[PDB]
């Protein structure tokens, strides 16, 4: 009777249902089929399928022994210095009868949030008990994991999902949910989720719950980004060196309540795929990056964005 | 113990130049409530020896002994940083610019411990301990704000001495409460006087022509003059008027780098110049010093209208070097833009 | 209450500025009427692929390439050929004395390769031969003392020796300190008692539970003795105490330094200290023998991993391993673990390369090490992708993803490998036609200068993902750089920004890719006209060559454009020179090196040149003649030359 | 033991201040009912805002309680706004009993002297707004700021705003002569005129400079040279030399002049300030003034970023030389 979220309802159960990062997913597939997986650290952007891949790997490796041979510790758990020295170490020393080539798995989700002292204690207990236990860590920024932890593991890299893969999984969810849609709504959902599959599924479910149909206006009504048509028109006006119309669009966006940050972010995202020459695109990207740095430093006014549009207009009006 | 520190004066009466300023600093000390000092001037001018003379005038002879201690301070981002420190019973000396953007992690904490020691140590000599701040011009904005709040908080507890080369980067709040002591570079005759006095105290005699040549080659740097005189002493037992003053190795390396820049303007030569600049950077030579030396050795071969453009380009890329992190990009960008401009000038 | 608020301004009568009116000039009176009418987005529908890389056509059969690799066991002949190939690759390596040991080690699996190929005998340690020689010798004297004690006990019923009861082993992570002490202990029959940071080690705990290991015998002297009981509290074998990672001190480890000092004073059995923090040897007080594991040679560890893969019936090239070890900064354990992951997954790619100096080779480990295989099709090479021009949106996204994956590490990929990927000849270091050739050379130089000005723009005026010089200053510094990681269990509670890193990396990657595309396209357009100059008879191709170092040519791609060994040596000799007692009290650091160091090198060079001419011996008494207590090898280092 | 003259020679009570008439009147009407509202003092620095409100607090509260019930805080804290938020929170959380022996019960509120209020971001000012409305009755705030227009809408709409118009040179010279005669330092009156010219209407900087000159000279005569060295002002002959080198059109003498100014220890920011003051008040053309002043602004920005004084000054002097030689 309860409405399960489509993020969890359509979660992959097998390792072959995971799109994107085909090389690392295939290597994890052959390790789940064979066994003797080493200690791994999967790093990448959010929403790309790291927790899903680790869970499917451990499920395929253990099966009925997943109930007792698996120890999962995410950021909602304690994972302190005493937790690392006691609970993880007794699970490492714990006797579990497993088939040959199968080891106990200690998943440490969100190892970025793990405290440095906890990792410093984790080093040796991950090193010595490797005959019977294995460690699978998942993180977003691998720099937050200290160097001996990365030395005691194998670091696997995940990238952003290509819009083709997000489109294929979106069609997979749509064809199992009776979701009416059009192509513009699909383009809007893919745009609102820049390389994230969780954002794509959440935006699809939110647009289906709010309006029941998938077109662009519905997606941007339920997600409320600055519209890429408006930003594309502003960039086109800056290409034609029309400061008046570009500032008209910018001031309309500013009076709609959008922050400087998402306005400059959408400007960069539209400018990344804009159809112009390579030199003009390079100057536009350089000026957008300079203005974005200025926004990040603290000075974020309409004067800064008006000065950008103008530096974009004078890129074309001047040689 | 070279000649630069064996004959460093220990009291304000033994200084040879800036004698009026030395008397003024003595009168400052005798008032009993001397303020935070902001000592500034060029390198080799004599700021550190005047600060040491002030410290020996304030306390007893016990400041002349020094000891090195290492302090490990926990950053609020939870990553401990360990720094070295020269200290005595009465004064501390620190350089927090070694801590990067965590310099405030020294500033808000280290002097606080000294303040703790000011309620722990009791000597009945003076009610403060002098904290010396070396290269305070290299601090950041928030580091200087931390320093401002620190001297506000522990005014009656400890006194501050800020030694720098340029007061351009320091904030006007940090200058509005410190007495400014400008120590200009000594003149040529003053360097000749110091060189003759240091040679007589060692038992040697050097001619006036050689001393004048050393003073002119030092570019009004007394420490560089003393080091070059010691090198000339190493080279020859007697001092002759035509004795060749030996040159700095990285300076002549920079000179051949400038000659290689001028000689040919090709991508291959650009790569060798990049390799030479990397070799200089690996020798811990600061990149601002490399930029200044490159501009100094490239303006000789330039023409009058080209000189202003080359100087403005060098200043532009040195500001970029200050803003950025990897200085080889800005160094070689200046270099390559200079070869492009020089080639365009030579074709016409 | 609700008092009133007033704005009191001392407005005196007059001054012509307090009461001001809008000016009567026509320029500032005819205000333009603001219009809010923007274009209507309801009529304009968004086509597919307008804001993304979406194509109506989809590739089928090119992806999902299952390996299904069944590696046959290599015969003796091809094993001998590959062993001779590695012999050719490493002439200084003694190949023959290492292979039978690994064959015995290998002769369904359930342990990691780090413990599968764990060196049981101390001679199997790669590199650091002086350190392992010192450790093996020192444990020989300690085993000799234990046997002498046993002989004295059975018969009953030390400045000259200078046998210090402890060594401190320091080095990088994973170079093999713990492996070396374990191998030596197995060779000499010691029994390791390991105290590590993974267990509770408070001072009274470690004292009251481990003094009797040092002060007494072992009850079980025969049988199962050479084991490793890790201390915790939730032939005759001599006990040995090992302290792994002594630099890691917690608040729960109360008085651990005092406890290990009490161990230091009152022990009768050898004690090893293992750490990777270089500051600890200066922080800890007491008498200990210093042993330093330097970073091992890249070719030796590369041939060792080639041995490891050859035993597992895998044939590889030494260049891929050199790239992997350069990326892993010569971490042996990290390289072994990633090699295990990459081999047991089925290798990189099936490619054939004929080398005499046969099964297909397996190059491509460093490409999948950085996750570049997750972006590219498995028929695409990285440099082949970089050399050709880029036009279609999908491989533009591939380039952007490559650069932003390399930008999260704050590593500059296109700058570090600029020569090898620009369309220009690269060589390792050992008239109107002239106007046209000079014009082409000037065009190439202008494109290069514009590109590197753009790169300086990126480095200075754009946000970086990781905050540079966060805890120390910038690169190539001598004053510090020993920023150890955190040691406390409380959280950071910082106010960092996450949007301005994820967007910043994409922005920097996009700008770098666009600038490199512009520079490469301009250089290729300039080199299109090289045929006319070659027909004219003048060849500026030499003026167009790139002269790179030999060590940079040994890799598929480099992580940096500098020499790290050189820089580490320079900073090391700077600390060595200025650690002298007379020079410890120099206040500044910048002018200290800038002025003190070159005249010191000048005096050293003059002293060496005076001694080369057969002068009097008193000329070697200048430095210690004025009490410059500086070590002699650093004096010989300063006296060589200035590079 | 001793205290510098700038705080110890302030006005003790209200109406002892000078050159303010309406401010003192409304302040006295506030002290009459013992009801001091939220205050916003804006004006040039050293005009006497802090002295005035400290005098008002000494009028309102007893001197043994005046130090206890006021708290001087600074808004340019680099650790964020939550630090000063919790500082004022636990300063107003404590309720220490106090009384006056003169026969008047003390008002219950406390005083927070929050200076540099115009250096706060809009979010920090909003956090301050929520803190002020939280402590609406237990403590009434004051904000010392340079400009009233930097303070955001909800704070400025509720605190009474007072402008402190700057003191003239004559009243400042009279006050400085008072300080000199009362502190027993012998300094000629043209030196005091030089002091009020150098400090540029900053009476607090003038008092600090006079104290530093008194305790640095040693009771002898304070010449203009000692004041010039204390204040960091570059003497005008160096500025004239810079301008003559630029007007000559030769780069080598320009380099020599810049090197002579650099090795004398003179700051580059002070030189940029004095060149700007010279340039904006000359008979130069408007385009020359525009180009030179824009270059001075970018050079000031580059010097704040830590660029080398020598390179920035030689680039600025090259720009000035080009501007002064393109017309001749
Ligand atoms: N590659 C993928 N293929 C298919 N579905 C995916 C993929 N990645 C994410 N999803 C979907 O998105 C949900 C969330 O994915 P997660 O694996 O939890 O993301 P993540 O890799 O853990 O990133 P984090 O947790 O933010 S660091 C899954 O339950 C799936 O429904
Ligand atoms: N020189 C080497 N020769 C052979 N195997 C090595 C070598 N160095 C490391 N290994 C392998 O890598 C594993 C880990 O080495 P360790 O000795 O634990 O590293 P470490 O020197 O202790 O540095 P830490 O402990 O990470 S700070 C060993 O058990 C070996 O399997
Ligand atoms: N009055 C003086 N008489 C003799 N030698 C001096 C005198 N003043 C300075 N020196 C020498 O000049 C050098 C100045 O160096 P230092 O005090 O570090 O100045 P800075 O900090 O500006 O470099 C010292 O080594 C000192 O030996
Ligand atoms: N109007 C005035 N009347 C009397 N003294 C004044 C006046 N203005 C300034 N002063 C003196 O000048 C100094 C200015 O200090 P301060 O009140 O902090 O200035 P501000 O508050 O304007 O920054 C005080 O020591 C004070 O004695
Ligand atoms: Mg997850
Ligand atoms: Mg170890």
UniProtKB/Swiss-Prot annotation, chain A:
Record-linked CDD domains: AAA (cd00009), HLD_clamp_RFC (cd18140)
Annotated ATP binding sites: 44-51
A single GO cellular-component term on record: nucleoplasm
InterPro entries (UniProt xref): AAA+_ATPase (IPR003593), ATPase_AAA_core (IPR003959), DNA_pol3_clamp-load_cplx_C (IPR008921), DNA_Rep/Repair_Clamp_Loader (IPR050238), P-loop_NTPase (IPR027417), Rep_factorC_C (IPR013748), RFC_lid (IPR047854)
Transmembrane segments: none
Compartment(s) of residence: Nucleus
Keywords recorded for this protein, A-Z: Acetylation, ATP-binding, DNA replication, Nucleotide-binding, Nucleus, Phosphoprotein, Williams-Beuren syndrome
Modified sites of kind N6-acetyllysine: 131, 272
Predominant place of localization: nucleus
Known function: Subunit of the replication factor C (RFC) complex which acts during elongation of primed DNA templates by DNA polymerases delta and epsilon, and is necessary for ATP-dependent loading of proliferating cell nuclear antigen (PCNA) onto primed DNA. This subunit binds ATP.
Disease linked to the protein: RFC2 is located in the Williams-Beuren syndrome (WBS) critical region. WBS results from a hemizygous deletion of several genes on chromosome 7q11.23, thought to arise as a consequence of unequal crossing over between highly homologous low-copy repeat sequences flanking the deleted region.
Family named by the database record: Belongs to the activator 1 small subunits family.
Protein name: Replication factor C subunit 2
Organism: Homo sapiens
UniProtKB/Swiss-Prot annotation, chain B:
Residue numbers carrying Phosphoserine: 124
Signal peptide as annotated in the record: none
Subcellular location, record wording: Nucleus
SUPFAM superfamilies registered for this protein in UniProt: P-loop containing nucleoside triphosphate hydrolases, post-AAA+ oligomerization domain-like
Pfam family for this entry, one: RFC_C
Residues found modified as N6-acetyllysine: 19
An example Gene Ontology biological process: positive regulation of DNA-directed DNA polymerase activity
GO CC list: Ctf18 RFC-like complex; DNA replication factor C complex; nucleoplasm; nucleus
Keywords: Acetylation, DNA replication, DNA-binding, Nucleus, Phosphoprotein
Summary of the function given for this chain in its UniProt record: Subunit of the replication factor C (RFC) complex which acts during elongation of primed DNA templates by DNA polymerases delta and epsilon, and is necessary for ATP-dependent loading of proliferating cell nuclear antigen (PCNA) onto primed DNA.
PANTHER family: REPLICATION FACTOR C / DNA POLYMERASE III GAMMA-TAU SUBUNIT (PTHR11669), REPLICATION FACTOR C SUBUNIT 3 (PTHR11669:SF1)
Protein name: Replication factor C subunit 3
Organism: Homo sapiens (Human)
Curated annotation (Swiss-Prot), chain C:
Modifications the protein undergoes after translation, according to the UniProt entry: ATR may stimulate the RAD9A dissociation.
Annotated GO CC locations: Elg1 RFC-like complex; nucleus
Sites where the protein binds ATP: 171-178
Any GO BP: intrinsic apoptotic signaling pathway in response to DNA damage by p53 class mediator
Localization of this protein: Nucleus
Any one GO molecular function term: DNA clamp unloader activity
Keyword set includes DNA damage: yes
Chain segments carrying region Interaction with RAD51 and RFC5: 431-518
Signal peptide span: none
Keyword field: ATP-binding, DNA damage, Isopeptide bond, Nucleotide-binding, Nucleus, Phosphoprotein, Ubl conjugation
Family stated for the protein in its record: Belongs to the AAA ATPase family.
Subunit structure: Component of a heteropentameric replication factor ATAD5 RFC-like complex composed of one large subunit (ATAD5) and four small subunits (RFC2, RFC3, RFC4 and RFC5). Within the ATAD5 RFC-like complex, interacts with RFC2, RFC4 and RFC5. Within the ATAD5 RFC-like complex, interacts directly via-N terminal with RAD51; the interactions is enhanced under replication stress. Interacts with RB1 predominantly in G1 phase via its LXCXE motif. Interacts with RAD9A in growing cells. The interaction with RAD9A is reduced after exposure to DNA replication-inhibiting agents. Interacts with BRD4.
Protein name from the UniProt record: ATPase family AAA domain-containing protein 5
Species this chain originates from: Homo sapiens
First-to-last residue of the parent protein present: 866 to 1844 of 1844
UniProtKB/Swiss-Prot annotation, chain D:
Result after altering residue 319 to S: In a breast cancer sample; somatic mutation
A Gene Ontology BP annotation from the UniProt entry: DNA repair
Pfam families associated with the record: AAA, RCF1-5-like_lid, Rep_fac_C
Gene3D superfamilies: 1.10.8.60, 1.20.272.10, P-loop containing nucleotide triphosphate hydrolases (3.40.50.300)
Task performed by this protein: Subunit of the replication factor C (RFC) complex which acts during elongation of primed DNA templates by DNA polymerases delta and epsilon, and is necessary for ATP-dependent loading of proliferating cell nuclear antigen (PCNA) onto primed DNA. The RFC4 subunit probably functions as a scaffold on which the other complex components can assemble.
Family: Belongs to the activator 1 small subunits family.
Protein's recorded name: Replication factor C subunit 4
Provenance organism: Homo sapiens (Human)
